[PDB]
């Protein structure tokens, strides 16, 4: 569910 | 101005254990997740593994789960690879890769990549 | 996974040309589609971003196009500059790359 490819960066 | 410098790579036996490091520079490393992504003769580019800004989220390419470990220590502006049980389809030329900018996509990409350091596992 | 079919592996062309690599993905990415270049001993460099924008420094005479499954770059005027190797990456799900394709000088 987690998405790999979301936004790794500071929200 | 952005800089990765990927280090630690060397000629080492099979089944040894060896941490890549690679140390950011010219930009916010703390607020960016990173990327490890190898490339060999024989099988290309193969992305390997992201970690999260903060260090949280870390995914794996399948070939190395539970082999490799991925950290990070933003006090030092350094992102690791943790390689264990080296095999001979490890070797590869090691690239370190920043996630690209945050915008409003719900997909990421990378945008600027380090020189590389060379892996050879090799009785 | 998603697997990306790049084409030609290898193309001789003369300066000037018009340059065209394809790149197909095994089922849609719509736009989450990245092209490099990447000449020997050096890193991968981001051309374009999600499919067709033009990234920092690099020159007008590259372009990317595609939406779905088929994707292009082309280099409508091929300068000296620009013989390396090309390597497309979807990143929607995980990041795999293309096979990559030499453009080669032609005499």
């Known amino acids: 569910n987690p998405d790999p490819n979301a936004n790794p960066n500071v929200d | 101005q952005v800089l990765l410098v990927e280090s630690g790579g060397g000629v080492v036996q099979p089944g040894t254990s060896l941490r890549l490091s690679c140390v950011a520079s010219?930009?916010?490393?703390?607020?960016?997740?990173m990327h490890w992504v190898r490339q060999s003769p024989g099988k290309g580019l193969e992305w390997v593994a992201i970690?999260?800004?903060?260090?949280?989220?870390?995914f794996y390419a399948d070939s190395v789960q539970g082999r490799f470990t991925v950290s990070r220590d933003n006090s030092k502006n350094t992102l690791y690879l943790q390689m264990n049980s080296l095999r001979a389809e490890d070797t590869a030329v090691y690239y370190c890769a920043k996630a690209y900018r945050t915008s409003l996509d719900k997909k990421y990409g990378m945008d600027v990549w380090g020189q590389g350091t060379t892996v050879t596992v090799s009785s | 996974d998603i697997q990306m079919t790049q084409s030609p592996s290898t193309l001789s062309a003369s300066v000037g040309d018009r340059v065209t690599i394809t790149c197909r993905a095994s089922?849609?990415?719509?736009?989450?589609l990245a092209w490099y270049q990447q000449k020997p001993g050096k890193a991968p460099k981001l051309l374009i971003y999600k499919a067709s924008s033009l990234e920092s420094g690099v020159p007008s005479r590259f372009s990317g196009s595609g939406s779905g499954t088929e994707f292009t770059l082309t280099i409508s005027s091929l300068h000296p500059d620009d013989f390396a190797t090309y390597f497309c990456?979807?990143?929607?799900?995980?990041?795999?790359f293309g096979q990559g394709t030499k453009v080669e000088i032609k005499r």
């Open positions: 089922q849609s990415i719509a736009s989450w």
């Open positions: 010219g930009f916010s490393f703390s607020t960016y997740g």
């Open positions: 990456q979807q990143f929607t799900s995980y990041w795999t």
């Open positions: 970690i999260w800004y903060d260090g949280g989220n870390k």
